[PDB]
Amino acid sequence: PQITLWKRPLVTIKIGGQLKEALLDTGADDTVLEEMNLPGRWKPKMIGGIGGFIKVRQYDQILIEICGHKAIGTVLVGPTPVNIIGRNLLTQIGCTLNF
Amino acid sequence: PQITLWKRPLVTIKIGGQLKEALLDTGADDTVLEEMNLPGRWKPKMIGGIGGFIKVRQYDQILIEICGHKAIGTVLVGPTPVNIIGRNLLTQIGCTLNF
Numbered sequence: 001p002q003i004t005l006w007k008r009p010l011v012t013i014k015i016g017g018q019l020k021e022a023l024l025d026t027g028a029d030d031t032v033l034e035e036m037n038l039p040g041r042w043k044p045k046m047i048g049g050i051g052g053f054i055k056v057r058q059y060d061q062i063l064i065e066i067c068g069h070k071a072i073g074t075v076l077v078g079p080t081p082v083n084i085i086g087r088n089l090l091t092q093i094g095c096t097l098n099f
Numbered sequence: 100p101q102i103t104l105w106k107r108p109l110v111t112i113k114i115g116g117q118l119k120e121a122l123l124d125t126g127a128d129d130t131v132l133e134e135m136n137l138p139g140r141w142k143p144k145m146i147g148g149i150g151g152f153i154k155v156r157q158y159d160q161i162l163i164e165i166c167g168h169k170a171i172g173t174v175l176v177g178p179t180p181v182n183i184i185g186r187n188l189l190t191q192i193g194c195t196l197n198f
């Protein structure tokens with residue numbers, strides 16, 4: 001679809017078999033989700049945001065569906081204030097900005 | 100133009116008579132700029148993201164030009180690591196997400 005920006009660009013995602021709400025975030029390199037259980041192995045990693053750096057769990061090659069578009073990529077799990085879909089997955093679903 | 104998301108969506112802006120590079124950030128409600136000594140009234144604010152909060156100064160009715168498109172609105176100024184164009188100004192320049 002075409003998504004205007006007068007409201008937050010929230011979408012329903014499917015991951016680990018559960019539905020969630022997440023923000024399409026072109027200012028995020030990476031996809032970061034609030035604390036949750038995910039199957040598979042993970043490695044500890046750090047990521048930085050506007051306020052500093054946090055510890056996250058890095059899950060690689062995770063299946064995630066975003067508005068019915070499929071992506072398979074890295075999902076970071078940790079104390080983000082909001083579930084965000086970053087460019088690593090936005091590129092997989094063909095997302096561009098246009099003006 | 101059409102901006103793909105393989106790399107950060109960085110564009111040149113003009114604000115307070117200065118040129119800067121900034122992120123077109125659909126994940127930001129409002130616009131946050133690197134510390135700069137703008138004239139006029141302001142009010143202090145705290146804004147939060149990954150890693151916590153930073154203190155900013157909120158200026159209202161600021162003119163920013165984004166890739167030749169003029170916009171005027173609220174800008175927050177403080178120690179952000181990157182200039183961030185948020186939805187308050189992205190709407191004004193006709194910017195949409197498309198996939």
Ligand SMILES: CCC(CC)CN(C[C@@H](O)[C@H](Cc1ccccc1)NC(=O)O[C@H]1CO[C@H]2OCC[C@H]21)S(=O)(=O)c1ccc([C@H](C)O)cc1
Nearest residue numbers: 027028029030048049050082126127128129146147148149
């Ligand atoms: C989860 C945060 C979202 C949702 C609440 C909001 N943020 C925008 C988001 O796009 C940031 C933009 C950013 C910040 C620092 C360095 C680079 C890019 N990206 C980001 O944290 O991405 C992480 C993930 O991937 C990694 O790449 C980049 C850094 C890593 S914000 O900046 O905190 C913010 C908060 C309040 C306002 C006003 C008050 O509305 C305006 C902007």
